[PDB]
Write an enzyme that holds these catalytic residues in place. Structure first.
Site, PDB file in Angstrom:
ATOM      1  N   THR A 139       0.844  -1.186   0.000  1.00 38.95           N
ATOM      2  CA  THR A 139       0.000   0.000   0.000  1.00 38.95           C
ATOM      3  C   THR A 139       0.882   1.241   0.000  1.00 38.95           C
ATOM      4  O   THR A 139       0.690   2.105  -0.821  1.00 38.95           O
ATOM      5  CB  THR A 139      -0.916   0.014   1.233  1.00 38.95           C
ATOM      6  OG1 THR A 139      -1.466  -1.306   1.449  1.00 38.95           O
ATOM      7  CG2 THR A 139      -2.066   0.965   0.971  1.00 38.95           C
ATOM      8  N   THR A 140       1.884   1.296   0.874  1.00 42.35           N
ATOM      9  CA  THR A 140       2.779   2.427   0.937  1.00 42.35           C
ATOM     10  C   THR A 140       3.497   2.617  -0.410  1.00 42.35           C
ATOM     11  O   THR A 140       3.795   3.755  -0.782  1.00 42.35           O
ATOM     12  CB  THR A 140       3.763   2.291   2.082  1.00 42.35           C
ATOM     13  OG1 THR A 140       3.006   2.135   3.273  1.00 42.35           O
ATOM     14  CG2 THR A 140       4.695   3.596   2.256  1.00 42.35           C
TER      15      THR A 140
ATOM     16  N   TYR B 196     -12.771  -3.957  -1.277  1.00 44.26           N
ATOM     17  CA  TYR B 196     -13.906  -3.418  -2.040  1.00 44.26           C
ATOM     18  C   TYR B 196     -15.028  -4.427  -2.331  1.00 44.26           C
ATOM     19  O   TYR B 196     -16.194  -4.073  -2.168  1.00 44.26           O
ATOM     20  CB  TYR B 196     -13.455  -2.724  -3.352  1.00 44.26           C
ATOM     21  CG  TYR B 196     -14.610  -2.332  -4.247  1.00 44.26           C
ATOM     22  CD1 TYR B 196     -15.393  -1.194  -3.947  1.00 44.26           C
ATOM     23  CD2 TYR B 196     -14.938  -3.100  -5.399  1.00 44.26           C
ATOM     24  CE1 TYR B 196     -16.459  -0.833  -4.717  1.00 44.26           C
ATOM     25  CE2 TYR B 196     -16.020  -2.724  -6.224  1.00 44.26           C
ATOM     26  CZ  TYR B 196     -16.760  -1.586  -5.858  1.00 44.26           C
ATOM     27  OH  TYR B 196     -17.827  -1.184  -6.633  1.00 44.26           O
TER      28      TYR B 196
ATOM     29  N   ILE C 197       5.851  -4.014   9.886  1.00 47.12           N
ATOM     30  CA  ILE C 197       5.948  -3.548   8.534  1.00 47.12           C
ATOM     31  C   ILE C 197       5.306  -2.146   8.549  1.00 47.12           C
ATOM     32  O   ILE C 197       4.086  -1.999   8.750  1.00 47.12           O
ATOM     33  CB  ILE C 197       5.239  -4.531   7.540  1.00 47.12           C
ATOM     34  CG1 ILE C 197       5.884  -5.934   7.640  1.00 47.12           C
ATOM     35  CG2 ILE C 197       5.250  -3.977   6.066  1.00 47.12           C
ATOM     36  CD1 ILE C 197       5.087  -6.954   6.800  1.00 47.12           C
TER      37      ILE C 197
ATOM     38  N   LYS D 117       0.526  -9.555   8.581  1.00 49.55           N
ATOM     39  CA  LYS D 117       0.682  -8.142   8.794  1.00 49.55           C
ATOM     40  C   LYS D 117      -0.671  -7.728   9.308  1.00 49.55           C
ATOM     41  O   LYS D 117      -1.686  -7.888   8.632  1.00 49.55           O
ATOM     42  CB  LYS D 117       1.068  -7.424   7.499  1.00 49.55           C
ATOM     43  CG  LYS D 117       1.157  -5.917   7.764  1.00 49.55           C
ATOM     44  CD  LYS D 117       1.577  -5.155   6.478  1.00 49.55           C
ATOM     45  CE  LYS D 117       1.369  -3.692   6.684  1.00 49.55           C
ATOM     46  NZ  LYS D 117       1.575  -3.057   5.367  1.00 49.55           N
TER      47      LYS D 117
ATOM     48  N   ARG E 281      -8.973  -0.049   5.137  1.00 46.48           N
ATOM     49  CA  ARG E 281      -8.914   0.242   3.686  1.00 46.48           C
ATOM     50  C   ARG E 281      -9.701  -0.722   2.833  1.00 46.48           C
ATOM     51  O   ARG E 281     -10.110  -0.332   1.713  1.00 46.48           O
ATOM     52  CB  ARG E 281      -7.501   0.242   3.134  1.00 46.48           C
ATOM     53  CG  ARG E 281      -6.626   1.307   3.677  1.00 46.48           C
ATOM     54  CD  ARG E 281      -5.167   1.021   3.293  1.00 46.48           C
ATOM     55  NE  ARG E 281      -4.328   2.216   3.557  1.00 46.48           N
ATOM     56  CZ  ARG E 281      -4.223   3.277   2.727  1.00 46.48           C
ATOM     57  NH1 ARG E 281      -4.852   3.290   1.543  1.00 46.48           N
ATOM     58  NH2 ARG E 281      -3.421   4.283   3.040  1.00 46.48           N
TER      59      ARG E 281
ATOM     60  N   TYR F 294      -2.272 -10.089   5.019  1.00 44.71           N
ATOM     61  CA  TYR F 294      -2.334  -8.658   5.341  1.00 44.71           C
ATOM     62  C   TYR F 294      -3.788  -8.223   5.511  1.00 44.71           C
ATOM     63  O   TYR F 294      -4.597  -8.170   4.572  1.00 44.71           O
ATOM     64  CB  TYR F 294      -1.528  -7.880   4.296  1.00 44.71           C
ATOM     65  CG  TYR F 294      -1.558  -6.375   4.302  1.00 44.71           C
ATOM     66  CD1 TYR F 294      -1.897  -5.634   5.443  1.00 44.71           C
ATOM     67  CD2 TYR F 294      -1.174  -5.672   3.147  1.00 44.71           C
ATOM     68  CE1 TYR F 294      -1.879  -4.219   5.402  1.00 44.71           C
ATOM     69  CE2 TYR F 294      -1.207  -4.328   3.090  1.00 44.71           C
ATOM     70  CZ  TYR F 294      -1.576  -3.610   4.220  1.00 44.71           C
ATOM     71  OH  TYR F 294      -1.605  -2.269   4.165  1.00 44.71           O
TER      72      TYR F 294
END
Ligand SMILES: N[C@@H](CCCC[NH3+])C(=O)O
Ligand SMILES: N[C@@H](CCCC[NH3+])C(=O)O
Ligand SMILES: N[C@@H](CCCC[NH3+])C(=O)O
Ligand code: NA
Ligand code: NA
Lengths: 295, 295
Positions: A45-46, A108, A204, A162, A139, A134
């Site tokens: 994502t980052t 989503y 992370i 994560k 999000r 993760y």
């Protein structure tokens, strides 16, 4: 595995035309090697996975490996919200040299717990690289709970998770249902140190991008049970754990890295936008307070 | 322009090999023509946009237009969480024959208000087809509020917005900031009658996949000001407004349509999974109570 401690979810630096700035990406890799970071996650994502089409996404993971040249493990981002897209990213990374893969739960489209299980089983079946799950419902709009992660520990190349919820009680729930060997990483900088103190294996991180030395110290000390040293290192950097989130990650952290001279250009891909000026002083202050030089 | 009333967000039926079932897709379009539906959205959230790659996505929109043969408007799904990707999808639909495009806000990467404005502006600049915005914070993790939507009204081919928040107070706030010519569609079946009564123009809906005649009656009555007739039609189908969300849409509605014999197979693509046996009795009842003949 033995991947643990301080792991940077690396930004993807861009040029002025929005193409990937490979010169800066190489400089970010050297920087992490020098500063002692334990591992690099490429295109999480980052790293703006969403706005890298597959070919660019895997070019970034691949070049990150190449820049690392055996000196630091690189973990490839491989999440998708279509099980087939996730297998495709996995297969494309099989030949890369990656220590492991990190895959966000489908976002989503909101799969049921059995769909998450089937999704990750299918992705794990497509490789022998270790896979790290993760969870970030803030999000993705699905909370993959410990009693779902548990039903996946048996997959021999699913090695860890994560969790970004900031719910530190999940460390004990996960330890009890998954065993001592399942790797548990915090994805929430603000609760990271506590998450290590309660039993986690690593972090992370976003803040890592800009304070890797102190962050590494914080993490080692917490894993070693030296809590005073851990809190003392956290103290210095703690303001970044809110300031790097004034606008969605990685909008702020990318601004900070440019401002520091880590990367040539501040460019970020739509629909993300450069940090708005109303937050510049907020962040510059937090960077000063974290002992980050310039200006 | 002239798209309003009861609009079905069409399911995408699949063969048991997971390929698209165009024979049932064709049957769906005829069914809606017969039952009086005002328009079809192809490849919205209900249509599994997530697990259709781009060229299948286009195939579905294009076949749907073809089956419609000018007898009912077809609106093409063109949302993406990368602006460039939304542009590509829009460009491929430019000469398909669609009346409009429906674009969900970026999901998972959480862009700021100005990023949403820039994203939709860029997407609108790439076509002359009318564009309907789509806000569903429960899935995307970004809530695009009336104030932000208001700044896109002046874009000549952004003609309205699908809001799925179920926050019916937004009808008034959107009217006041956007004017009477902006189209307002409810994305939330449970509050759709109310959304119409308070001033909305239409509903882009899940329930009208399986009760199109009654859902149209309800929409026609609400728009015409005949609230008693609207409420009488709603009463009969109201059970579906919660029963079709017992797992994430389109899991239940796709099961219902199969069970009715509208589509040959109930297949759905990973990570989505077929409706869990535990909800079968619940939805079958909600179906009987809406007067659906179980086939
Ligand atoms: N933007 C899409 C496709 C990404 C392709 C790989 N990085 C998504 O977030 O799923
Ligand atoms: N699964 C990706 C790619 C979509 C391809 C177009 N329907 C997403 O949700 O954005
Ligand atoms: N991130 C976008 C880029 C545009 C399409 C490149 N051919 C995608 O996922 O496809
Ligand atoms: Na395992
Ligand atoms: Na307009």
């Amino acid at each position: 595995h033995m991947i643990n401690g301080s792991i940077v979810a690396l930004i993807t630096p861009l040029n002025s035309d929005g193409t990937v700035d490979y010169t800066s990406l190489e400089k970010l890799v050297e920087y992490h090697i020098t500063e002692g970071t334990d591992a690099i996650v490429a295109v999480g994502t980052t790293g703006e996975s969403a706005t890298l089409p597959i070919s660019e996404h895997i070019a970034v993971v691949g070049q990150t490996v190449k820049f690392a040249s055996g000196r630091i493990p690189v973990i490839g981002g491989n999440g998708a919200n279509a099980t087939a897209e996730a297998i495709e990213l996995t297969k494309a990374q099989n030949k890369l040299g990656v220590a492991a893969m990190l895959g966000v739960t489908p976002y989503y489209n909101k799969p049921s717990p059995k769909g998450l299980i089937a999704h990750y089983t299918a992705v794990a079946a497509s490789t022998d690289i270790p896979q790290i799950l993760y969870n970030v419902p803030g999000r993705t709009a699905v909370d993959m709970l410990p009693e779902t992660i548990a039903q996946l520990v048996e997959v021999p190349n699913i090695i860890g998770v994560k969790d970004a919820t900031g719910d530190v009680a999940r460390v004990k729930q996960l330890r009890d249902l998954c065993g001592n060997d399942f790797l548990l990483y915090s994805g929430d900088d603000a609760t990271a140190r506590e998450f290590l103190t309660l039993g986690g294996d690593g972090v992370i991180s976003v803040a890592n991008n800009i304070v890797p030395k102190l962050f590494k110290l914080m993490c080692d000390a917490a894993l070693a049970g030296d809590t005073q040293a851990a809190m003392a290192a956290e103290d210095q950097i703690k303001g970044l754990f809110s300031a790097l989130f004034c606008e969605a990650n990685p909008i702020p952290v990318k601004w900070a890295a440019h401002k520091m001279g880590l990367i040539s250009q501040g460019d970020i891909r739509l629909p993300l936008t450069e940090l708005s000026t109303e937050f510049h002083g907020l962040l510059l202050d937090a960077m000063k307070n974290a002992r980050i030089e310039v200006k």
